[PDB]
Design a binder for this molecule. Structure first.
Ligand SMILES: Cc1ncc(C[n+]2csc(CCOP(=O)(O)OP(=O)(O)O)c2C)c(N)n1
Ligand SMILES: Cc1ncc(C[n+]2csc(CCOP(=O)(O)OP(=O)(O)O)c2C)c(N)n1
Ligand SMILES: Cc1ncc(C[n+]2csc(CCOP(=O)(O)OP(=O)(O)O)c2C)c(N)n1
Ligand SMILES: [Ca+2]
Ligand SMILES: [Ca+2]
Ligand SMILES: [Ca+2]
Ligand SMILES: [Mg+2]
Lengths: 524, 525, 524
């Protein structure tokens, strides 16, 4: 059989049946005779390709397969790869290389030093030394992406390899099962469980790997047993806990001092599936107060090594959450009281306050809606105001790289055609991957895009205000017509200048047949 | 003085007065107190930032300075950087890093292993070990970008460094003059000149570094003296020669066999300012036919090393072109035989043949117009049908990475406000960096964008055919309304469905005072 | 406190008390005021420094701390690092950098692009962005080296950092405990155990990570329960099983076809703590023969991904071995019968056959002796003739890089003062790290070095025969006097041109209280 045929067999055997791509000549010999059982999702720029794939992978909890064009295409996607690294997204990124005979002379489209291009943003990066090695290399990519801690990988393939003969011993690859579903040994796990049982005032902090593992329900049981308040770790890329459950306490501020203060008085803090911690703002202070001990369960050795405090256990989040939830004692302590619902903010007939927008989404959106956040200046409000009962309900750019949410929302909606996806996106952020709108239109993926238009890079303006930095250029983005941009790519567009228009647009969008963009006039 | 003050002084003293950027929090400490003698050019996505800066650098023939946001911003620009590497564009790329106190924990926005991120697409990548070193690092970046062979460099700076004290000895950096304007020693140069004078049937091949060096006029004189046919090297990022001058033979096809055939019978082939060669399609054959020797003059040791044939000389293209032009003897040989005229393809009343588009542009555009090309299936015809007689009249993505021409056209037009820029871009290519349109509107940069809309990735459909490849997905791009995209970003838009609308649209565009986009309905392949 | 004092405090708190180094001016600010609770072990060249630390780490089963001089010193050690990578040795490699103020001008002894220098042979490689970060970076280094899969790490430190003020919050690093002692979840472990219980003809293959984990005894119990033959995986850097135990079947040949033939008719092959597989010679064929299924337990995701056949589980070897050993049922099958004793080779009164050397060693050496192998051409014979009953009894260069055995034997002897270390090295290999001898002399480390002098690169000469390769230069190394070399570095030296002198030299050597080298005239 050919490398071509063997590789598609390996993919399908390993559960992959979709290719997210933007095509090129180095990739045609891979894409020719495209298997009918495979689906190809085209996007018009590679940041969009990767972002869609990323949303798909994250929501589906399985690897996604990407096909890019040489160095230029790979390059266009490297911002998106920065997010994917930080979210542990299992992405198999393949790029076409020139024919081996023309690599030496560096003909046009030659990916020079190809494996180094995507570093340091990939778990594994590789170009095979012969055509017959390609299926084995593809097998390595699949598993490296899929093993804890999950993340993106890179495979570069000379386009003349595909038509060559595959090693018949490659059949050994098709059905390999590789597991990293592991948990702490019995002896040490017992020691951990006793420490949890003995805590007089425990707290739990959850990160994105909990939602990726679908460990949310186990985490709920664990919290209910320990009678423990539950926080989301800072700079949250996903939502790992029902936000109206009694133990929930919200999103932790991304600051060193703020967090040690929040945790003051808690004798044991159990962190699951988070870096410790993804701080952001300068907020110097104590990592922890005396009296607080921290214990981290992470799937990522890199996270365990760099935590500035606490003990760490490196293991699968699914396996560990389930074990803990089922082993700890039911504490007789009082179950935490649910946090008070957010207070309504006075809204005039002027421009919308973000608080108003989120309140209104909460009232109108389905219970199983999925939200995406690319409105940096309104994240705190969004966390306080949306009731997210179910797993897989929130995605935001894990590395802070703009250009994630608009394409990722399309990927998520493809992964979950039964759950209404709603992407809330700043006017500044909307532009980075604006062409992804075309894929929603073309593939009939009915994502709803809510553009928060305040004419500025608002978070930046605020920060500038905090540093008392004057004469900063480039903070204002006037003069974009988002309804026209939507029409450009074939997506239905609506506008909302006040709350009542917001209500009507959301009503129309929820019921519309295709994707819908709503441009919302908000206050800076 | 602060690192901030010292850095800005270094920059102005080294001739930089423009920052192309898309700002972020790590860069705020650098952008604050923005000096009145600098201008900032904002663009909405980093591929656009770098593309605009790239066009500006190439047309102005001077380094351009860029400021991006950490890893994500840098990442978003790495396609553009791929082109800049191949074009030898002198781009100084700076990106903000987390405050040093928070790098260890890898706080959000931390550029991990920052210097490795843009490798291998940069001549130099670095993060300084202390705040006081920033100015020195910046100086290294300026000179690494500017020395032959020019190209992009990268510097990562922790945002807390800017307010720190700068080494007082930094002042020695301000007026540093570094030169690589060098040519072959007299002895060996004379041997080269003798070889040219002795050749019975010399041929000249010119690459983009000729136009970068503004050596075009010197190459014209060289070609005339030797009465030599002049090619442009394949996959041309620039135009190094007047395309209707009698020596001009055309753009070489990017094929090994094709090129060796074109050079058949030429005893000495002189290549100047090109890789040998930037082939593309698979065209197996001889690199050179027997009886033909090749001598390459390149500014780039990497090009000299990888050439599969020929002698090479690594030197400044400007200095070598000038010396050779003035040293070689005047041959009494006959000039090359006149090239035929391109056919006027019959045009019905419907969608436009690209040949029609190019013939019309060439009839209506000013003699000093500057074209950009990201209409990939139409390149051959474009080169056959446009008379480009002046230096700096053509730019195309040097690494074949789409998303170059649209922003680059804005930067070129910014660099040359007296010459009308006309960017010819396929409907597929138009999307990669569509948001650059906003920069043209906001700063009122009057670039003309001609979108060739055939509804497909035409060059890919063609290659799929040649390869006889069936059931290739993803080659069609229906359903994009470029007039609405234009409106979206505040750019005037026109539509041209036939020849008469094309003429009328171009006439209005050429008169217009701001940027203008024309969507042209072209024939489908 | 200073970065210096805070860093030594971290070191001691994390169990480190020994520094293996070859000093330089960038390192003097670190080495000054050397704590009284630490010892420094000097060697004269950096490949020796690392080899010795490597032997020490592997034997002690704990990380080893190393301090080298900038780029040149690091560079001299990079062959030693190749071996340490392949053996998963937990080595913390520190190197001094120029003072921060001079790095930009690239003063002499600046380590340029320092973190890239030891790539790709280290798990983590880093230069801190500030002095106050050094302790934290050291903590990262300690934990990245020590987490499964263990391996070498690199940390570069500008020499001016040590006298600067530390971060007061560094104290949170001192007592961090980081575990990767994990095993497969109960449900999937039960499935694995069932497969093993149900197999009709199992086989077990053990690699070096078994010996690293001190899982040998659990593996013995597992083999005994399952009544299964036990191989050692090819290219063995350690001995994971008692070699005269009845299940033991020896070292597998390092070939694809040789291995599938060995495993033919074994329905389930369980591999533990080995790559799958470290083949060497070209020996094309089937990875497995039909009817064999393979299950790999590895501590290393990179091993699991690259196996061309079988299933894998990525987990701690110690935890998994112990679990399986205690869960599997006692098979009714008959316990495998021990391998026949090695036949005595005809030995005349001249130069020694290697077979004769090993029998003599085996007959004279103490039961708890530890051997090291750097005699490539006699590896097979060695495994068959040395009775090794105990764990930690064998070390050979895991990446095949010469220069390991001599210094590593010194490290091992330092780690195991009550066990006699005997290094068997070829006259060719002896030279690569000859100066390590001095360290043994200076610290009175009583290793025994047996040099097998045949005046040629025997393995190469042989290979050349199988390649039918004529006119290969550089295969012969005549004219080396190893006794004078030993004397050169202060080590007592003996000779053995025949069996009789071999016996007497060995008796002397074993009695010796200091190091002893024995030059032995072997055939070929
Ligand atoms: C790819 C990328 N480029 C630049 C930045 C820097 N940055 C972070 S937030 C921000 C402003 C976002 O604007 P908008 O989407 O309007 O959100 P708002 O602040 O207005 O709520 C910018 C420019 C980034 N994080 N990622
Ligand atoms: C960033 C990037 N992505 C993908 C490609 C592969 N590619 C090269 S030409 C081409 C088609 C371009 O189509 P269009 O711009 O419409 O011009 P046409 O081919 O129709 O003349 C594609 C997809 C590329 N060169 N660069
Ligand atoms: C650092 C290094 N250099 C070169 C080699 C290649 N090599 C492997 S074995 C060998 C010869 C070893 O001979 P000797 O140590 O005398 O033992 P013999 O082969 O004679 O049994 C060589 C050169 C290597 N493995 N490592
Ligand atoms: Ca905004
Ligand atoms: Ca097209
Ligand atoms: Ca030998
Ligand atoms: Mg890189």
């Amino acid at each position: 059989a050919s490398v071509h045929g063997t590789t598609y067999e390996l993919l399908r055997r390993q559960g992959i049946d979709t290719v997210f791509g933007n095509p090129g000549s180095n990739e045609l010999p891979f894409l020719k005779d495209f298997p009918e059982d495979f689906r190809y999702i085209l996007a018009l720029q590679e940041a969009c390709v990767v972002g869609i794939a990323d949303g798909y992978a994250q929501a589906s909890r399985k690897p996604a397969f990407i096909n890019l064009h040489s160095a230029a295409g790979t390059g266009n996607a490297m911002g998106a790869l920065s997010n994917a690294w930080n979210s542990h997204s299992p992405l198999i990124v393949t790029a076409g290389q020139q024919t081996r005979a023309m690599i030496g002379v560096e003909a046009l489209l030659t990916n020079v030093d190809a494996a180094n291009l995507p570093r340091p943003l990939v778990k594994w990066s590789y170009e095979p030394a012969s055509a017959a090695e390609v299926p084995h290399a593809m097998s390595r990519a699949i598993h490296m992406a899929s093993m804890a801690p999950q993340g993106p990988v890179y495979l570069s393939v000379p386009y003349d390899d595909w038509d060559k003969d595959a090693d018949p011993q490659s059949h050994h690859l098709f059905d390999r099962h590789v597991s990293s579903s592991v948990r702490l040994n019995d002896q040490d796990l017992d020691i951990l469980v006793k420490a949890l049982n003995s805590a007089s005032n425990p707290a739990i902090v959850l990160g994105p790997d909990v939602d990726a593992a679908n460990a949310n329900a186990d985490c709920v049981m664990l919290a209910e047993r320990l009678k423990a308040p539950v926080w989301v770790a800072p700079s949250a890329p996903r939502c790992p806990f029902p936000t109206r459950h009694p133990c929930f306490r919200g999103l932790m501020p991304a600051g060193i001092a703020a967090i040690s203060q929040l945790l003051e008085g808690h004798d044991v803090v159990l962190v699951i599936g988070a870096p410790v911690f993804r701080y952001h703002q300068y907020d110097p202070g104590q990592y922890l107060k005396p009296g607080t001990r921290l214990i981290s369960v992470t799937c990522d050795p890199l996270e365990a090594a760099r935590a500035p405090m606490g003990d760490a256990i490196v293991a699968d989040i699914g396996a560990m959450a389930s074990a803990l939830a089922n082993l700890v004692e039911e504490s007789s302590r009082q179950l935490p009281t649910a946090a008070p619902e957010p207070a309504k903010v006075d809204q005039d007939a002027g421009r919308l306050h973000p608080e108003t927008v989120f309140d209104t989404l909460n009232d109108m959106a389905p219970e199983n809606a999925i939200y995406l956040n690319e409105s940096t200046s309104t994240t705190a409000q969004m966390w306080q105001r949306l009731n997210m009962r179910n797993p897989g309900s929130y995605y935001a750019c894990a590395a802070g790289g703009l250009g994630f949410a608009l394409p990722a929302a399309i990927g998520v909606q493809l992964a979950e055609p039964e759950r209404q996806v709603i992407a809330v996106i700043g006017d500044g952020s909307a532009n980075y991957s604006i062409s992804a709108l075309w894929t929603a239109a073309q593939y009939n993926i009915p994502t709803i895009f809510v553009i928060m238009n305040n004419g500025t890079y608002g978070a930046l303006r605020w920060f500038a205000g905090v540093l008392e930095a004057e004469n900063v250029p480039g903070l204002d983005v006037p003069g974009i017509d988002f309804r026209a941009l939507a029409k450009g790519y074939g997506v239905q567009a609506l506008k909302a200048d006040n709350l009542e228009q917001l209500k009507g647009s959301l009503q129309e969008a929820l019921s519309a047949k295709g994707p819908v963009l709503i441009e919302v006039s908000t206050v800076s």
